[PDB]
Design a protein around this ligand. Structure first.
Ligand SMILES: [Ca+2]
Ligand SMILES: [Ca+2]
Length: 275
């Protein structure tokens, strides 16, 4: 039996599904630890590995990338779960090794591959406390080229009046995503700051894991994928919209929650956003 993770329902994805929009023909790049090609609930369109010690992008030795991937697009079938955009073209861009770590150079290489291959959306469920001029140039290049860039805000909670948003989420050209529970209350570990843009479900997210498994994870990393998937749905209904419009729409149709320092514009609503 297939289950619909509540997070999918929480952002109202199923409404677009009933209109017949499930993100067909939208190229989505999951820049992460890879995507387990042996998983029956996932359909991978292609990929590349930027990790010199692990050249097969289809081998997820960390489990992160496979989980994120399932949130974006777990197939609409008789098993497992269901992604936000079940018909989206998924690309495995591996930039993190087994240990969940990666060099900035690998990540930038990953972002450049995504640009060169015309991805419509890029998801980066990763963050670092420090930015680099090179990482900034790369994401700015992606937005300029027309790609929609989504990233986790970070799991550093609060720190008085200080911004705890990690990079690349901190960059203005990137859509930084924080996490809320099922009640719409901000997750205690969710990062905060002027750079936080929107909220999405990040608590106890059921998705796919390597080796034909399923399990729950908590984190802003789990939140990001919900937004990337929303973007795919939007693009499936309005293939013509620029990244500018997709972003504006997602931020202008949110369900306002509390102070923007802690919640950005609030929880996304893809039914509203998709027009
Ligand atoms: Ca399924
Ligand atoms: Ca941002």
């Amino acid at each position: 039996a297939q289950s619909v993770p509540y997070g999918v329902s929480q952002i109202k994805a199923p409404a677009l599904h009933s209109e017949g929009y499930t993100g067909s023909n939208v190229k989505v790049a999951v820049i992460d630890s890879g995507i387990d090609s042996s998983h029956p609930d996932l359909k991978v369109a292609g990929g590349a590995s930027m990790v010199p010690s692990e050249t097969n992008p289809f081998q997820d030795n960390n489990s992160h990338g496979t989980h994120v991937a399932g949130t974006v697009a777990a197939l609409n079938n008789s098993i497992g779960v269901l992604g936000v955009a079940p018909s989206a073209s998924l690309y495995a861009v591996k930039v993190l090794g087994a240990d969940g770590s990666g060099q900035y150079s690998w990540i930038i290489n990953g972002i450049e591959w995504a640009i060169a291959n015309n991805m419509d959306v890029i998801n980066m469920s990763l963050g670092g406390p420090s930015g680099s001029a090179a990482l900034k140039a790369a994401v700015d290049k992606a937005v300029a080229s027309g790609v929609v860039v989504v990233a986790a805000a970070g799991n550093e909670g609060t720190s008085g009046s200080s911004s705890t948003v990690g990079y690349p989420g901190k960059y203005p050209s990137v859509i930084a995503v924080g996490a809320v529970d099922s009640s719409n209350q901000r997750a205690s570990f969710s990062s905060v700051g002027p750079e936080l843009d929107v909220m999405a479900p990040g608590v106890s997210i059921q998705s796919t894991l390597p080796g034909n498994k399923y399990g729950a994870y908590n984190g802003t990393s789990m939140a990001s994928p919900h937004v990337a998937g929303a973007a795919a749905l939007i693009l499936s209904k309005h293939p013509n919209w620029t990244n500018t419009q997709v972003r504006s729409s997602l931020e202008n149709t949110t369900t306002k929650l509390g102070d923007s320092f802690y919640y950005g514009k609030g929880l996304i609503n893809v039914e509203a956003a998709a027009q």
